[PDB]
Amino acid sequence: MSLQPLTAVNCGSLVQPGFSLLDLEGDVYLFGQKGWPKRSCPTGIFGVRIKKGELKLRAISFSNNSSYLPPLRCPAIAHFEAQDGKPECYLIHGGRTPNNELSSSLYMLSVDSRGCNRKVTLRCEEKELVGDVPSARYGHTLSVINSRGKTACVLFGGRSYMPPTERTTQNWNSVVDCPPQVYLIDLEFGCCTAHTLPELTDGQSFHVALARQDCVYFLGGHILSSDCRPSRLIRLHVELLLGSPVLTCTILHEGLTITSAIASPIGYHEYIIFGGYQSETQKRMECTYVGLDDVGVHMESREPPQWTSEISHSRTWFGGSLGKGTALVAIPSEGNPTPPEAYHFYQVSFQ
Amino acid sequence: NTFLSCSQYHKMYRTVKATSGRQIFQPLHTLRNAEKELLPGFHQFEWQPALKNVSTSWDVGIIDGLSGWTVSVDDVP
Amino acid sequence: IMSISIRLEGEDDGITIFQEQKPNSELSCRPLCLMFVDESDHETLTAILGPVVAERKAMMESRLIISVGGLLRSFRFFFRGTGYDEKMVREMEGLEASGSTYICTLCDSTRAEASQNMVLHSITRSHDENLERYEIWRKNPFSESADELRDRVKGVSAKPFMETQPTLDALHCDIGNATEFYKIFQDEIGEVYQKPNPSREERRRWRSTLDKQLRKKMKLKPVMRMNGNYAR
Ligand SMILES: [Zn+2]
C-alpha cells in the first residue's frame, strides 16, 4: 500500500481516461487508445513495461487468422479461466468506438505464441450471438461463472444512448440506464439468453462485479435515474440446468458507495478495491479490502497510501489493475503551456 | 458590417440624434428584436415525409452542441 | 449555398434558376457549428458533430416545404462535402494520415508506383465501398496477415463516418505546387544533378541567395510559410 510516481519515457498521448488493462500470461496489455490505430501499431493494443519508474509501451500483433478490433472505450471485461478447450480467454464486449458509437459485437482474446524474441503474438475471434442478444451498451459488466460444472457468462448493467425511436438531435449525446434484464451466454455456442429479475428494478453502470464458484456479487451501483450510489451489495446465484439455467437473486444490507472502481486480485480471492469516486465530486480516497469466500464478502480497510497533494486535490482520476497487489492510476495534469503530457502516473503496490 | 459595440453604437446614435436630429439611426433596443428575422428560428416550414430522429419544433434558435451530455463525471467528462 | 435549379414539370433536366456569382469570397460562408476543441482528437470532434451528420444524412430523404413568394413550395437537396483540407478528409474517410504508402484519396496506387505512371488512372474511391472495405478489414474473412490485408483493402484502417465528395481542394493544391517549386528552386540555385547528396548548410545557403534574389528583383521578402498570395 505505497505509491510511486512514474514517467512515461515517450508515447504519453495515446492513453485516454477510459481504457482497459488485461494481464494475461506474464506481461500486461493495455487496450483502448485515443484516436484510431496509428500506423505505428495497426494492432491497437500495447504491451506495457515498468522499468525504474520508466513507462515503456511496445507494439503487439495478432495472427493472420485473427480478427482486427476497434479500440473500444470502456467495455466490459471477463477473465475466462484457463481451461479446455482454449486456455486462457479474455472476453470483451462491447465498449464505445473512438468514432463515438457503440458496438454490440463480442470479442474473445487469447495469446498465440512467443517470442521469438520475447515478443508476444495474440489472437482475436468474434462470436455471432444467437439471441436475445443485449443491444449495444457500455459501462456494463461481464463475468464468468462455473456451475455444475460448465462455464457460462453473465452480462448485466450499463447504459446506452436513447432508444432508437427517441433518438433526438438535441438529446443525441444523452444516455439512459439500460433496462435491468441480465443475459446468460455460452461461449459455445454463442446462444445468448435474456432473463428478468423482479428485485432489480433499475439499470446501473460502472458497478464493479465479482464472480466466485458460480455466484456473483455486485458492489458499487451508481445510477443516473435517481442520482444515487446505493452501497447495498447485490448477490445472485445461478445453477446451470439443461436447458433451464435457473437463477436467483438477493439483497445485501451493506456494500460500499464506490463508482468505477479499480479491483486488484492479490490472492486467489484477497481483493482490494482501490478507488473511484465516493460522491458526485468527492472522489474516494481510502482503500478497501474484501475477502471472498462461500461465506461471502468480508469487509475491512487498509491504510490509504498518502496521496500527494497533486492527486489528493485533483478533480478526477482513474486507473487499472496491474494485478497482484500492483495497480496503476493516472492524473489529468495541468500546464502553461501544456507539456502536453497531461497525465502523471502513480504505480501503487499492496504490501 | 463594421464591428461596432453596443455602447459604441449607442454613443454614435445619441450623438447624431442630439445634433440636427431628427433621429436617423435606430436605437439599440429596436435592433435587439429587429434582427430576429435574420437569425434562425423564425420562419414556418415542414418536411414530407417528416424527418427522422429530429424534434420537429421549427422555432428554436441557438443551441448548445453537447446535446444533453449527462454531466456525470463518473463517465467521460 | 452554391446553386439552385428547377426540375418541374419534368421531361428535361433542372433549369438553372440561380447559380452563385462568387462563392469563394467568404462573404458567403455560413457558419453552423463551433467547438472549442482540437482538430485531431477524434473522440470529442465526433461526439459533437454527431447530430449534424445524422440530420444531414436524413436530409437527402425527405423533401422541404417553405413559405416563399407567398406560396407553399417544395424543395429537394444535393449535398457535397468538398471544402475540407487533405488531412481532415483522409482522417474522416478512414485513411492513413497522411503521407503514407497510399496517397491519393481517389486512385489507390502506391506511392512509388505513382512515379512510374502519372496520368493514366481511374477515380474509384467511394463512401459506401469504403464501408465495405472497412467491414472486410474488421471481419478479416480471408485470414490474411497485416500487410496482405492492408493491400486487400488498399489501406483502409479506420471506419469513416462523414461522407465526402471525390474531389480535391483548390487552395491548398496551389500552395503545395507553390512550395514544391519553392523547394526545387532552392535546389537548382545550386547543383543537384551534379550533387548527389548536399548538406543542410548548402540547402539553407541556396535558400538565402534565393531570398536575396526575390528581394532585389520582384521585391519579395520571404515569409515563414508561403500562403495563397505569396503563391500567386
Ligand atoms: Zn490517384
What overall geometry of chain A do the principal axes of the alpha carbons give? globular
Major sheet attributes of chain A: 8 strands, mixed
Distance between the termini of chain A: 5 Å
Number of helical segments of chain B?
Answer: 2
Biggest interface, chains and residues, is:
A-C, 27 and 29 residues
* CA-based gyration radius of chain B: 21 Å
Shape of chain B: elongated
Main beta sheet of chain B: none
Structural class of chain A: mainly beta
Helix share bin of chain A: under 10%
**Oligomerization status of the protein chains:** part of a larger assembly
- What structural class is derived from the secondary structure elements of chain B? mainly alpha
Number of strands of chain B: 1
GO molecular function (chain A): sequence-specific DNA binding; zinc ion binding
Subunit structure (chain A): Component of the RAG complex composed of core components rag1 and rag2.
Keywords (chain A): Chromatin regulator, DNA recombination, Metal-binding, Nucleus, Zinc, Zinc-finger
Family (chain A): Belongs to the RAG2 family.
Describe this structure in words.
This is part of a larger assembly, with one copy of chain A (351 residues) and two copies of chain B. Chain A has 351 residues and is mainly β. Chain A has one domain (1-351). Helix content of chain A is 1%, strand content 43%. Chain A has one helix at residues 309-313; strands spanning 2-8, 20-23, 28-31, 45-51, 54-59, 61-62, 76-80, 89-93, 96-97, 101-102, 107-114, 120-126, 138-147, 150-161, 175-177, 181-185, 192-196, 209-212, 215-218, 234-240, 245-251, 263-265, 271-273, 288-292, 297-300, 318-323, 326-332, 343-349. The two termini of chain B are 38 Å apart. Chain B has helices at residues 6-18, 28-34, and one strand at 45-48. At the A-C interface, loops of A face helix 1, helix 4 and helix 5 of C. Zinc ion binds next to loops of chain C. Chain C: Its main location: nucleus. Chain C: Belongs to the RAG1 family.
